[model samples]
Target: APTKNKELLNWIADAVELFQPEAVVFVDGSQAEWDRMAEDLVEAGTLIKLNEEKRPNSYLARSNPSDVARVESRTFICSEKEEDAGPTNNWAPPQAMKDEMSKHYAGSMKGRTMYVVPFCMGPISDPDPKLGVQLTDSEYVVMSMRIMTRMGIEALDKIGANGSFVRCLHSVGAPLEPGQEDVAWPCNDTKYITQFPETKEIWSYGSGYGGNAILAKKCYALRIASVMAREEGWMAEHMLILKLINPEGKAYHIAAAFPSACGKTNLAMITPTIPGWTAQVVGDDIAWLKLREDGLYAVNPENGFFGVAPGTNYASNPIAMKTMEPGNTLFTNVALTDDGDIWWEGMDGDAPAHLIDWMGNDWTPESDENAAHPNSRYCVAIDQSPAAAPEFNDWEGVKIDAILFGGRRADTVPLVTQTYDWEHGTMVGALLASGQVGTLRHDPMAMLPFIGYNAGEYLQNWIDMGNKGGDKMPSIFLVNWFRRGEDGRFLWPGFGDNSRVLKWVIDRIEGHVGADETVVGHTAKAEDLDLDGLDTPIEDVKEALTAPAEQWANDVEDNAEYLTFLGPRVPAEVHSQFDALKARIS
Candidate 1:
């Protein structure tokens, strides 16, 4: 009804004909609409309003225990060819997957409201905003999408006559009969997070979790958008974008990729400990990247941050804590304090005397199980952050000065290592791993769970970009703030102190600093980093940057096996880069 887009209208009609919803609600992303949905969710026992005095307009939601996180095993990339899906992805024939999901979608919204949510992933003013129209039966999803995307009539207008948008359909897989009772969280045992990359469509069923049902976030932004980026010669990455400024007033854009729960949000919203240095959040998740003649640029596609809540606190990420201070935040699968506030594992201060766990059961520190789910989350608007960058809404995006690939390795990886060039940088990202000690899980570019096509080919894309950006390519670096000393304590003081590392990054980018050439890359000596007024011992910092050639030899050997297992789709540049490393380290 908002536009004369025949394709959108026909698709909506087809969805209605199949789902047979009791009502069709077109979300306008107005305050009144949000209020109505919130009230409706409260009435249905899906959301608990936090105490007005303590949290104002905030609310807490307890999800079904089985529906906590993304169901990676059930997620499928329905590429026409299995080869396109790659060895890392689960692939099913597109038509067969569609037929199976259609059966579940049929009459699924019988007693529910089918909400047509028109949203744009990037800025609406972008020359070609990545638009999507999601048809969902879940009001919670509709409300969440409103916070996470630039949704409503404006987005619909962007997808005007002759404009195209990604088609997304989601259902909780619960169909109510004429008089059947409904539960607070509706989901089915059978779950399928399927994507049709060729058609740019998302069909998610069963779970009501944000990652599963909120089709706009990962479903369209990363999974479907990744394929679109690959075809369009851009990139959709699971990276966070931040704007860093030095005392001199020069600003630099840094985009870093870290797997979930690895402090991506904290870095995006970090309060620089180094005096005169400042950090501003552009986006906490999902970066859409483009290589221009001048340099590599990045845009924060999502309007909100869906941050892991278990480990965020005032000391760790005060900016993130402040961002969620405003009333419009949503807490999911997190403990509810008796005074009507949210509590997660790493929040400031001690645990409350008594609390309601994520499952609505009584919980206290004495409880054997965790009060909050490991994957608990808070969703809030990005602009709510006190340090949100002013240019966060720019259509052209910020030109990146540097890119960081980091993981939770306590050894081998240095505090920071600058790659020789973009091709070598791709290899570092392709070998991105996170975990403790010897047990590490590689998530190339931190896009392991999100890449839409063959990961080897994904690496190829990174390698190919080396030629595209040419002289203007951003400097690439690897960092591991989690590196530890032989004494078993952290070497680099992480959190806000990460700004020290960032300063060195900018210096390296500007050719104002020097680093030791290590087998891994250009390793930073302790003297290379800014250590003024720091309490951490310089010896420990020196040890953290030490790239023992023997240890690196083992890492290179393991990487050889890893590349071999990734299959032949991995480009020659990757193998050559690693071979170069092996040759030097040996």
Candidate 2:
């Protein structure tokens, strides 16, 4: 890899200058600045005002239906070498796409205000902050940037005179085409959310939405930074960074990764029903982990959360609901209330029978679930969440007490299982499958997609990182909070109660927990978990902790195709992990 490219810096700087933004103001992330930008967006029709005053200080703004969530399939990891890009990722030839993309980007913001956003992915106090500059034409993107990232002068100061950062260039893809006028959201059907991994540069066009346009979130933060992680000895993952504090005043920082809608939102900001335990959001979305001398320390790279909005009611995720209140949060593609409050498919409480859909049409309770878009989300700052931990933004970061890889497996997988060791944990993660139906295919954790550079290489990096940790690695466990019952009912009443499962995992980590030998790993014994104040029957608790050997026969069969999918790059230690699991079955 090239040691460092000074020319790369010059190229990005020149592009921002060339975009010729009408206004290139630095974002200080002040409330006044936020209000001003919010007002500007409302005037520009970029933001829609909601009626609710739940957030006495905050207001809600909805986005176009087409622009609510992430376009994961559309995201690409471009590299010069085809193999380096990997088939698992939507790979594209870098120079080719770059050539085509640059043309569309050239002076794309001609008539619009160019917001040159200087953002820091990690804490500003970080000795070496992961910095990036996003050039966009969308005012909505600029406003949300305040909540999504640490921007303005404070973040800019972290960038030294010869500061090296991940360079990103994005346009709303709505350049003023002389003859043809454009609509409000001028995104190309053929979008390119491309990342040049080798160059540590990102070029995104076509989408005006945050996930697609905001260079900081997944695009650069996880996609590009993940590639850099492998190169720089770290792991960039789609995991939640959270701090779990029990009633005894003991705190454990954990990094947990889960597939979309598989209770990650609930888990990260867990409101424990088991008494003493509580969960706080360090970051609800992504984590960057590095092995330090003390142990593996994790940092929630993003300043704010682009959290899933639907079903985030007082019962489901109260902290999130509270965080969204006060108007500082931005609601996207949700049902607007007559009183100006935002509503979605499952906010729990009763609401209007008929309302406007995300498509901005007249709708009712009988409309298609997709009309409101289950994937509709909110862009809110973490600072507002009452559950936000004080040490969340510490530059050095908190040492991770445990690392849990979770998926939605209904059978075979128990509520929690401790891996034999780090290598075993890595192997279990590689073959991480969340069983749903009769079909063998599944994409849990969105792990298959956006695995940085190459799938195999990414695993190899995982294995290599495992070895580097040696005896000091954080306790790694496999959790399945989505286990199902025979009658098609959920076995575990996940959500706030998930903290119970988490409590068991932490107890095991602290050596104060009990477990029984299982084929997959160590299944928590009924006695292991604190089932106090219990309403769940002992029989159900037994079922929750049980790992049936017969159910796991398919796991061995399923690993063949998955390992092959990982291909030649699959790590050697993975085979050892396979043999160990095979022995347990024998």
Candidate 3:
């Protein structure tokens, strides 16, 4: 009934006519269809159906060897104007890239079926849901998209009769296009993960990898969605939102951003080491925050967790481990055990004496190889997490109390730094070097090149959001768990012990804790950290908490270099942050 939208219907028709596909299928999101699709994938050798004894009707899939993860270099943010894409973005003026990609997409699906899959990004019942139409050749991506978003006929209903929709065009890049047909993986070497903000469309070609092919997951949900959010006066972030409750019965909500694979999921579903405080998952991977009268409210937007698998284990992330135990998860590029369960490097205390890796080759501890691919992943429903809150699906959303930004750092930054105010907090966020040096030889805040929308516009939006929320704005803090010791190992106990950092963060918000003023926001001294049950040497704890003067001087230089590296695109507010840091540190 929801197929009446002429724009969407016409878009699909245009693709079908141009691509000249053999068939066109519309997904109904039914169990029967899902099972049949799985069977189809198994038949096509795209997935390995595991023995039910080990993991039910679960399946394992490997990406093309050459196309394992997101290709950031090939990604582009296309807007009407070059400035909208920003200096940080890998960009091509809209018309040029669009015209180039269109030729490759034309008749590219000659022997394939073009599946017109309607999807809704948020809860189907929400008053507003981001709508998308994914035209894909790969059933694997269609299935993955179903897990990542609300999809199939169900999403069509959510989109309703005449709502605007994002057009997601994808191809496996299998068709030979004029030349360069000699490539091994059959992908067009010249790839384009192009987004057209004006028309609300994402054109991605040349790979079947999840992040690239599943247009709605990142390209639409975060990158394009961030652009849309800016236009609508909201914020779409690459951040995780969690609900934290202290033993004293006080409840606080936090949204944290980290570079991919560093610790976003772990923090979202953290097990508190503090005696009284408890943490529960709200949103991991992506968060869409909107400003209302009370404050900025955030939603996960994604229906499931598409988390990396390399460093997760029972001891390190039991919640994530337990969440995947139900057999309802999708394992990609992970090693399949002889008994049929999934295995990754850190999924076990020791590597299997012998096993099959993602490539179906023999693997063993003695083989000196990983049983799983480094970029292995597990896709499970968010509800499967024991830590996911009951309010996760509520469109009304949870009020955010604290917003924290972090990155993986051996030293340089302290364990936690609470800003004096929202503006400083904004500065902390803008100057955040805690996560992966995301881009510019530095992926600050793990945002790297994926800062979504225009970097300048995104920063302006952050400041505007702070201004709009007034006193209701959430307290902001910067954290780092990757501090190391002279022994060349992690200094902070990390893992569950990270809750101690959270406890202090909460205490500071409640006015029960104090922090020493620092050049980079305010740092917590060793005495400020909660260390009751912490097994790490107290000396290491002190070291982790303190940013020595030398570290501050280095940070000052690094920030200055980063500002220059960031070039003219960086806004004045952010540039002024480096000045303030330089002035204060000196």
Candidate 4:
């Protein structure tokens, strides 16, 4: 019953040999099966297990060793169970999770270039009993290659390629062929066509027997393509590939497992206060970051906003939300009519004859659906209030400065710390339903997905980029922005309610000062002040201004983690001036 499929094994061996990945990770499956697979690879002499006492320099063999030994071998093996790995499952407390995940995934790929292939052993979509039969290793390899292609890897040559040859083989329904054409995608009326440029590939079907599936292709000149459904469901959720770069230009690639509405956009827009530093958002919702041989991070824009936000308009961040067509945008959880004007029931807004409304119920199907309308929202420009827009093309390559890694946390404030490796950055701020903390695991090649190139080939190009003296090797900073009070409301010490405080800090960075005792009062001379002999009011006022200012300086000095990672040194006198101003406002 558990006989190995030699043909599939050979195919996998060939693919692995060509890609030459450092390791492969399995998600949501049994470790026993992984052990068997490892044995096979070892027998092939392609890998060797390292001694426990002597960490082998060539390849290391390890496992999570929980109820199941989540294996991590030189050849690669690990599993991520969806049920067990959602954002909220079995996760440690904020601080503890950060520490644990940091130790687990961080610096784990030291010295060796790693290829992480997150493999799923069952059908792409499996429902019913949910534990679909384990796919033969060969079937697994074929499916894995399909997944890679959907994620944007084109085979240089189709030798031994099984493109579109597999079938769903579901017990309840007839098996769906991979190369089948014109299948209707759920949610929208668009049909799947297997043609290129204009055709949409049907990668997999939904497990709920809902006919839901992923449609994708190489959208642009870049090697990266996307697979997505028009509807929203657990199986049709959104995934993103992000490229994180440091100041010196070294990049750490990351694959965002959590779907939309999980603060991916929020984290992307966060601005740090490093002097002579700013961020260039490649694409807020979806994008491809192409890594050139010259070590430059080129970016290409994907589709426009899915129009999911409610209550907020383009006012908050116009550049990101503005769209060209009115019907192209989709709104959720808001009230609407047929004519196109958005009307919020029980809420304040001018009700139009034809409006689309989506409010109340968390999972209402047609609750807030807006058509694609790009100009109807906001677009990025230099004059925008946020001032975070880039100087040139909205989707052009940029010389990266620093990578800020973080997540939303109510117990911690935003932090900026130098990673163990200056070229790599790590952030442990947010927590997902699954226990994985947001991290900047240092892998320059990890950026391949976002590089808009073939995932495997992109690695080689990235290597070349590093060798071309183009890898400036940017710095890394980890930030946390979550703090809580006794009552449990989130409190951001330096941000949130204290947004103006950042403005003050920025002003100080720019070297501007005012001399009012309430402003730069710490700079006032003692002799210049007039006061009665009985009580020198001038000295008292001066001391009062200087004391608060000195205290503010101490606060910054003590919280080195809060300062920008670009080596910013706040002078004591400047801190005094800042404190005096803060005292006046308070």
Winning model by TM-score: 1
Which has the higher lDDT value, candidate number 1 or candidate number 2?
1
Q: Candidate 3: TM-score?
A: 0.94
Q: Which number leads on lDDT?
A: 1
lDDT of 2 by residue, 1-586 (tens): 1113354346545876767655555556577887888787777665676654464444455555556556777677888887887758777787888778877777777767766677888888888888887777776777778888998767666665667777787787666644765464556665678888888888888787767877888778778888889889998887787898888788888888777742677878877888667778887778888888889988888878787777778888888777766566776677766565667867776657777676667776676654356767787778878999888889887788888887777777888889888878888778777655234544523466667677878878878988898887888788876666777667777776677778888888878976798987887886767567656644576786678877776567677567777778878888778877877776
Per-residue alpha-carbon lDDT of candidate 4 for residues 273-357, written as tens digits (9 for 90 to 100): 3322333343344333334444334232322222223323333323333321222122222343343234333223333434422
How many residue pairs in model 3 have overlapping backbones?
Answer: 9
Model 3 ranges off by over 4 Å: 175-190, 434-441, 567-569
Q: Rank the candidates by lDDT, best first.
A: 1, 3, 2, 4
Error of 1 at 501 (Å): 0.8
Tens digits of per-residue lDDT for model 1, 55-90: 878878889988878688889999999999998899
Tell me the TM-score of model 4: 0.34
TM-scores of the candidates are: 0.98, 0.93, 0.94, 0.34
> Per-prediction RMSD in angstroms?
1.3, 3.3, 3.0, 21.0
Model 2 global lDDT (CA atoms, 0 to 1): 0.75
